[PDB]
Ligand binder design. Structure first.
Ligand code: NA
Ligand code: NA
Ligand code: NA
Ligand code: NA
Lengths: 21, 140, 140, 21
């Protein structure tokens, strides 16, 4: 589940990064 | 010998409230501006990524408030920030911890939560320029 | 590696603030009324007996925030409440702790202060009826 | 100084008790 947490956090980060634009 | 935990809870809250007021006064003008930006951003994150955060909370089993599990949560968050220390992820972790405290509460009586807050804040403050750069770029 | 404690302090405060908000929501209607009476009384005590409390703080050397001394303060207050557990004195101790937190601050990072608050609140909640009787009689 | 603390707290209590009336 350690990798499952990192995946969800990564997506949140990825989305925030792109919405930064 | 006839104890009343409603008294106890009120007193704990009252004194904690008096302390929060003091900590606020001691915040510099720069910290206040910073606080304002963090609040706006992390509440915005709470809105848009609530399903993502709720899922994280389910994965971490935040409903389980046992000492054994609160530490497992801290270590998971800490290690996550190590393998992914982007400012964006740091802000989501702030929003995440905000969700946890709002789900279970926090009076300070739970010392493991105190460690979680302190250590994560410390990690988020690392490589500060990357975080300040991300935040100010967000407010345009 | 380029840490910024202004970030850290803001994050600690922000999360603590979110927790205080949650603790307030969880207060029952009875606790809220109680909180209101305690606030009015202990702020009134702060006003009239400030020279008495300031003197106590001088005796306890509250300016000294070393772990060794914060414990000496707790033990002194606790033992005092044991030898004199009147509701009036319990309220003065609340006002006293309010003065201490306002003088040095309290972010929860200082765990010994957390113990002081918890243990004193517990002692004040002992023999509750005597305290409720004293408070309600005061509000007429 | 233990007794000095108790004395100051006692006076505060004594005064609050009488002001209760
Ligand atoms: Na790690
Ligand atoms: Na690190
Ligand atoms: Na004692
Ligand atoms: Na006792």
């Amino acid at each position: 589940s350690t990798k499952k947490l990192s995946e969800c956090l990564k997506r949140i980060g990825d989305e925030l990064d792109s919405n930064m634009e | 010998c006839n104890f009343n935990n409603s008294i106890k809870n009120v007193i704990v809250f009252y004194i904690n409230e008096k302390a929060l007021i003091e900590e606020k006064k001691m915040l510099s003008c720069y910290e206040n501006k910073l606080l304002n930006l963090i609040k706006e951003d992390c509440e915005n994150i709470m809105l848009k990524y609530k399903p993502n955060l709720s899922y994280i909370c389910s994965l971490l089993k935040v409903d389980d408030t046992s000492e054994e599990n609160i530490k497992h949560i801290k270590d998971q968050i800490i290690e996550s920030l190590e393998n992914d220390n982007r400012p964006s992820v740091k802000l989501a972790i702030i929003s995440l911890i905000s969700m946890i405290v709002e789900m279970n509460g926090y009076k300070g009586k739970n010392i493991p939560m105190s460690f979680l807050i302190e250590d994560i804040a410390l990690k988020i403050s690392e490589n500060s320029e990357d975080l300040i750069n991300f935040i100010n770029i967000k407010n345009k």
